[PDB]
A and B are shown apart, each in its own frame.
Chain A
Amino acid sequence: MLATITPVLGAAVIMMAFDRHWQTTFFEYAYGGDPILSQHLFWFFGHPEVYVLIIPTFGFINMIVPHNNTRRVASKHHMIWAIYVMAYMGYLVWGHHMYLVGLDHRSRTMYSTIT
């Protein structure tokens, strides 16, 4: 997941630096830019970052609980596929952080229903 989102985050921050120090106006609406693009880029990186943070703790509990209970875990295959589909959905729910910024209702409904 980090392999997928790191280029997007890097592009976003590089564009921010260029806008700050070169006046490239990537996010100035007066002549073409839009801050909503910056929000989209960051949150495209954003939510997958939090899903990167949270998932390994599932591994920690799924290791500790069977060890002390000296029994097999409930469904390791299903848990793996659940975390993988969560990773899949992490790339289509980045807009639930941008409900109010004025996104089109089509995109907003897509984000809400996938979230």
Chain B
Amino acid sequence: MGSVWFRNRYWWYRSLYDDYVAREAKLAFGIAAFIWLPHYYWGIHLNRAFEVNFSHRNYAHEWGPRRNRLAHSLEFEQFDMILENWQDLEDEYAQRGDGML
């Protein structure tokens, strides 16, 4: 990782800048590992939140109208049951013209 791959390390430093910051670079390696940890964890949390939001968007796009249709059918079925009972009452009224009243 860095100058270890090169067999003329001096040239390397030279051929880059002729300036030397290797020790700071390695201290940076260690500290960078131990400081990137928490940002990555919170980013995992954020990524899960974004995925949940996209899943909700897909479900709302696809199944929202279906659920509304299902509710409409439920209400119409309640009216159908009420209408069947009302028609039974109407048949009884036809049998008995004013006995019910």
| Chain A residues near B (Cβ < 8 Å) | 74-75
Contact = CB atoms under 8 A, between A and B. Distances in A.
A75 B17 CA distance: 7
Contacts, number: 3
Contacts of A75: 17
A59 to B, nearest CB: 20
3 contacts: A74-B17, A74-B19, A75-B17
A30 to B, nearest CB: 45
Interface of B: 17, 19
B73 to A, nearest CB: 48
A65 to B, nearest CB: 13
A105 to B, nearest CB: 28
Contacts of B19: 74
Nearest to B19: A74
Nearest to B17: A74
A72 to B, nearest CB: 9
Nearest to B16: A75
B11 to A, nearest CB: 16
Contacts of A74: 17, 19
Closest 3 CB pairs of A and B: A74-B17, A74-B19, A75-B17
Nearest to A71: B19
Contacts of B17: 74-75
Nearest to A72: B18
B51 to A, nearest CB: 29
A79 to B, nearest CB: 11
A93 B59 CA distance: 43
A74 B16 CA distance: 10
